[PDB]
Amino acid sequence: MKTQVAIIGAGPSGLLLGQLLHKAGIDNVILERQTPDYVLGRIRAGVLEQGMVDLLREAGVDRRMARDGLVHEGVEIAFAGQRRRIDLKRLSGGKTVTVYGQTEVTRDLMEAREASGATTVYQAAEVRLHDLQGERPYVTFERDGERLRLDCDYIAGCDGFHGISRQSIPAERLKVFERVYPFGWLGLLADTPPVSHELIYANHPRGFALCSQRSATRSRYYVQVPLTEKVEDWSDERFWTELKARLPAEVAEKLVTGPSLEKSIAPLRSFVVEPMQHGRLFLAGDAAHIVPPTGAKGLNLAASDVSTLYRLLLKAYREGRGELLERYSAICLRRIWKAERFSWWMTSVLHRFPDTDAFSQRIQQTELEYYLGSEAGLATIAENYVGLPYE
Amino acid sequence: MKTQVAIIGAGPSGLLLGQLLHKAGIDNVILERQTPDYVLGRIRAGVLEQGMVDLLREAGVDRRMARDGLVHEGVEIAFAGQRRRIDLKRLSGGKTVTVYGQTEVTRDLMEAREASGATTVYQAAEVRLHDLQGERPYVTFERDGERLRLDCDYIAGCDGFHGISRQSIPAERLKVFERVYPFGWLGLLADTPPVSHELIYANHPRGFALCSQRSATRSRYYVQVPLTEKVEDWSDERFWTELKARLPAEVAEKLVTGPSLEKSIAPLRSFVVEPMQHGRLFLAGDAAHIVPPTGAKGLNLAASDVSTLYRLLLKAYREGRGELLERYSAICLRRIWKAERFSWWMTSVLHRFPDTDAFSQRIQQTELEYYLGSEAGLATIAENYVGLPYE
Ligand SMILES: Cc1cc2nc3c(=O)[nH]c(=O)nc-3n(C[C@H](O)[C@H](O)[C@H](O)COP(=O)(O)OP(=O)(O)OC[C@H]3O[C@@H](n4cnc5c(N)ncnc54)[C@H](O)[C@@H]3O)c2cc1C
Ligand SMILES: Cc1cc2nc3c(=O)[nH]c(=O)nc-3n(C[C@H](O)[C@H](O)[C@H](O)COP(=O)(O)OP(=O)(O)OC[C@H]3O[C@@H](n4cnc5c(N)ncnc54)[C@H](O)[C@@H]3O)c2cc1C
Ligand SMILES: Nc1ccc(C(=O)O)c(O)c1
Ligand SMILES: Nc1ccc(C(=O)O)c(O)c1
Numbered sequence: 155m156k157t158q159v160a161i162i163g164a165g166p167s168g169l170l171l172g173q174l175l176h177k178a179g180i181d182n183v184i185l186e187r188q189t190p191d192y193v194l195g196r197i198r199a200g201v202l203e204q205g206m207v208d209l210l211r212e213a214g215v216d217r218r219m220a221r222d223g224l225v226h227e228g229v230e231i232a233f234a235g236q237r238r239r240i241d242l243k244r245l246s247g248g249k250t251v252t253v254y255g256q257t258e259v260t261r262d263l264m265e266a267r268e269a270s271g272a273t274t275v276y277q278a279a280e281v282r283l284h285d286l287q288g289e290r291p292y293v294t295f296e297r298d299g300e301r302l303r304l305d306c307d308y309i310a311g312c313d314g315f316h317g318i319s320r321q322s323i324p325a326e327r328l329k330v331f332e333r334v335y336p337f338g339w340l341g342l343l344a345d346t347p348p349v350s351h352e353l354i355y356a357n358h359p360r361g362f363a364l365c366s367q368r369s370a371t372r373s374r375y376y377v378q379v380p381l382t383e384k385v386e387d388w389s390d391e392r393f394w395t396e397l398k399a400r401l402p403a404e405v406a407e408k409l410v411t412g413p414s415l416e417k418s419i420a421p422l423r424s425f426v427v428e429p430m431q432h433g434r435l436f437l438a439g440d441a442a443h444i445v446p447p448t449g450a451k452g453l454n455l456a457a458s459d460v461s462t463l464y465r466l467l468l469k470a471y472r473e474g475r476g477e478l479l480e481r482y483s484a485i486c487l488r489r490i491w492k493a494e495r496f497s498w499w500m501t502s503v504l505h506r507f508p509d510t511d512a513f514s515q516r517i518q519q520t521e522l523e524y525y526l527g528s529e530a531g532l533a534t535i536a537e538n539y540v541g542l543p544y545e
Numbered sequence: 546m547k548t549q550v551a552i553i554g555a556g557p558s559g560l561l562l563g564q565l566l567h568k569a570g571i572d573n574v575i576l577e578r579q580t581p582d583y584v585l586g587r588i589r590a591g592v593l594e595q596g597m598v599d600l601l602r603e604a605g606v607d608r609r610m611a612r613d614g615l616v617h618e619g620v621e622i623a624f625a626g627q628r629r630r631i632d633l634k635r636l637s638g639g640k641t642v643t644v645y646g647q648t649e650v651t652r653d654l655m656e657a658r659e660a661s662g663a664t665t666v667y668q669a670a671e672v673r674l675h676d677l678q679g680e681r682p683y684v685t686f687e688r689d690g691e692r693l694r695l696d697c698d699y700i701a702g703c704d705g706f707h708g709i710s711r712q713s714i715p716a717e718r719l720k721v722f723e724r725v726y727p728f729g730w731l732g733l734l735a736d737t738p739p740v741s742h743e744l745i746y747a748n749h750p751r752g753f754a755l756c757s758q759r760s761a762t763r764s765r766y767y768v769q770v771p772l773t774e775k776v777e778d779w780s781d782e783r784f785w786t787e788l789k790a791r792l793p794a795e796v797a798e799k800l801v802t803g804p805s806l807e808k809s810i811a812p813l814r815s816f817v818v819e820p821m822q823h824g825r826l827f828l829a830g831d832a833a834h835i836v837p838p839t840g841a842k843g844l845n846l847a848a849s850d851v852s853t854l855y856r857l858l859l860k861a862y863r864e865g866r867g868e869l870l871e872r873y874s875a876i877c878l879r880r881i882w883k884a885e886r887f888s889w890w891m892t893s894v895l896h897r898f899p900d901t902d903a904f905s906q907r908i909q910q911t912e913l914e915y916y917l918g919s920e921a922g923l924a925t926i927a928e929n930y931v932g933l934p935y936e
Binding site: 329330331332333424426491492494495498511512513514516517520521523524528529530531533534536537 | 720721722723724815817882883885886889902903904905907908911912914915919920921922924925927928
């Protein structure tokens, strides 16, 4: 087989790129290692920047989101007794965020693709990239037990952190920057009414807690836990009890608990690779960078990369300007680092770090007090939170 | 002898408190360990917040400053090639800073005090504090070889970091927060025209550099150096060469070098003591806290404490409300921590730290890029720089 752009991975990155391209006439083929069900079983993200909301509209996949997603005009930070609300709409100059599960975005994109009849190969084993620097690179894989070959002009590596894409670029061409946090998040999905109409990020002496939702009858909650904890050690009871212990007494007494639908521990990490490309291979999403979940930038950075790629690929294809693809990394990395800086800040002010002397404790508390008390400070939170402009 | 308020130390803190009090009718006595010349030989600070500028006016000691001080409406940060100017006046909502040597402030205050005939004892040895919790505390010292006793109601410990005041409070009553930086500043005073009409703070791969002035024909420059360096290792030549190496090529080629008047290495440190008082002893200035020189807060925090003390002492004395002095620490510590947070930030973004992996390098560079590029960010720099409001 042969296509124009070969897409490795059917997560949000891959599908969104696949949909935008297909809609513009550029044929693509998506190769996915797993089964659709397995993909749709991932809970992950729930917060979308406005820029991605419009990208979805542009991908023609927004009916359901426009109906079921929730627009939020403010978020709440709770520290040392108090609860401060950041009015995102006025502080950002009219911008907001939309709460809509990542699983849903995926579901919607998967519906759109199946209906378009565009090619998608799930359960594509042993994917290998070949001739990344020739005029005709190719992808090989196994379906059942046959080794097939796919010829294409370009390859978009949207296969995530553990994908094959990043490993296919010679180590000596890539420079890596990485930070691992000494903690992880233990998340919990439940079919219960959320505790607040807006999200609550809480800094507490026992660690960070987060109160989120997926809908009016579905809540997503998280608590900071040591990397040494195994999820089977945390029964529902323990989770609710621990959560309640970290929240404002008034919030805690309004909490409607219940049995979990999903529960898991996601470790925190920062990771950026430079550059994000090699010959005819371009990296997008988690295949190129990882951010701690604290500032909700992961899914959102995926979207921005994909937006930049789709638009450089249009010009190269319809306008015959293939030289523009050389600046892909330059464009993406600017946004990536800004997002990384914000995610790192959010993470350092809300989480309780192990082995912290008194001075840094006081500085963390004061960072909160200053930023949440100054008009200029609240603005740095708001404009970053809703998402900095696409360039 | 007997007075009302006994002041330990004749640095800026002590003199300013002494002048404000004396002007209000409250008699004070200042005890200084050294000679006037020795005090006036210290170069230290050169940047004053507006709030202190007015305090000086209120102390009736502003003629010379109003004439020789310089009002600055902007400062410049130089990093990775570029030079960005922060317009302080518009970003802070009309506020500015005044450049005027600390040695001058001292000189002016020392003139004012000698003329008022108010008591001042230089070369006061072996100062000891007694009865800090009684209704009548007292100070003892030696002048020549006689052990004198001074009776007072209150004692203001304005004797700096190595003073006797802080050591006179039982260790178990004070909680300390401290951070020591793995570097120091090697400053240099010269009788040469400054390189810019505004200050230039520079982040460079060899370390931080700072371009300041005292007047139109007198410059003060600094370069970051390891704590292991001794000032006699740095000849003038080496300083100028090293400075020029860390500045923007266009700035460096405009530099008018010359022989030094003064040269010294000041180590960086953060330090806060809680609370700042004990019985009838109240700590002010460096006797209570230390900040890295990066954000120019030292002399400025001294002034704010002294302002709070003078005003609580008025009420207690003339208005008979001695209970108000119990809240002295609460009032001062709020400002102190905010100032400490800003000085720490300034220090972490402009200095090159030893043993920093690639990720933190990129975050330091991006912290600069974001703050110096966002309107909300420049504002957090400006409002903090000019000085947050006195409460
Ligand atoms: C475990 C985990 C937890 C997360 N949790 C959060 C969270 O709590 N909140 C939040 O805001 N963000 C979270 N994120 C980030 C967010 O979900 C991601 O940023 C987003 O999924 C990235 O989209 P993507 O398409 O780049 O990668 P992915 O969603 O990882 O999609 C990559 C796809 O690649 C396919 N694939 C992988 N390797 C191969 C291969 N060699 N061959 C073919 N196909 C391959 C995979 O099966 C997967 O379908 C999480 C990410 C991870 C990995
Ligand atoms: C070495 C040094 C370098 C500094 N450099 C900078 C700089 O480069 N830039 C900047 O912005 N800020 C700098 N500062 C900070 C700024 O100068 C101080 O914040 C300011 O001097 C503090 O005023 P003060 O009156 O509290 O203390 P000081 O100026 O230290 O005055 C305290 C006085 O106490 C007297 N004294 C001490 N112990 C006794 C005792 N037991 N008995 C009686 N009298 C006593 C001392 O002789 C001194 O006169 C520096 C401070 C220090 C200590
Ligand atoms: N920072 C955030 C905010 C919300 C969620 C969420 O899952 O709803 C998250 O995973 C991270
Ligand atoms: N941060 C600053 C700014 C100016 C000076 C100065 O001495 O002029 C300083 O010592 C520190």
